[PDB]
């Protein structure tokens, strides 16, 4: 039942909606969700491509914007920024109630900037200013350039959702960049207590890549094992003396956010990823249908840290089979960027 969302909050995990559209906000639905336990919203170019194509409330907005001398990208941005600002307003009471720890809405920079650190910083600063809300996160792919940009953006006081993480090594690099940005601000006497960063670590895509060629005992297990190990890494990094010295001064830990948590293989229960990844100081962003399924027949239990030994043994067998999860992660990130760019080009074409 619906109270499962509150039960998960009590276990220390926020559940965000991995969807955004003009009607979601305008209908009052998002406001009702933010009372029923949903704690935030994520978007990406594919989410906007589908929303722009299917939501009737965009038609008049597009017709209005086609009367102006604007590029397709600025037409898209005007639409998307408006949706994000409206969603931020709906989530503000939640955000403020926790001291700025919840109630975020994420907007991703253009995929074509993913390997351009300076361009990413420039666009992220601009979109942060354009949205003009304290509870907006700018979403930045965790390429090497994105981690460079993360350090700068954090030092600028901007909250960031670092996305397309599939690698424990790259995630640790992100934590180090975050800490450098925080340390810069503290050295300069600037505030840090309102800077929030999430590390969006993707789940289903790992199993989709590997399952058809894995042995029985491993099918449907790798993505969860990888996430469990990532969370163990998180505990070790953020409790270490180095970060404790920053947290003592008001720094917030980065939080892991489980993304791509809709189940894509009908051989697995539809709540598999949500049920299996609940732990303290995390987020799970879920598509509508997965949110539905979890409310109907999900289970709220602190599963993320259970059986970490088995997760390690599974990852050791993955390596024994010759699957290099770091090579895989780089490919999956590359593939995700290609897919997001494809979606972005698809949504721009009707805005010409």
Residue numbers in the entry: 0 to 351
Paper text:
In the redox-sensitive enzyme transaldolase from Neisseria gonorrhoeae, the side chains of neighboring residues Lys 8 and Cys 38 at the protein surface form an NOS cross-link under oxidizing conditions that leads to a loss of enzymatic activity through ‘structural crosstalk’ with the active site. Under reducing conditions, the cross-link is disengaged, and enzymatic activity is restored. In the previously reported redox-sensitive transaldolase, the NOS bridge functions as an allosteric switch that changes the structure of the protein, including that of the active site, and thereby regulates enzymatic activity. We have recently reported the discovery of an allosteric lysine–cysteine redox switch with a covalent NOS bridge that regulates the enzymatic activity in response to changing redox conditions.
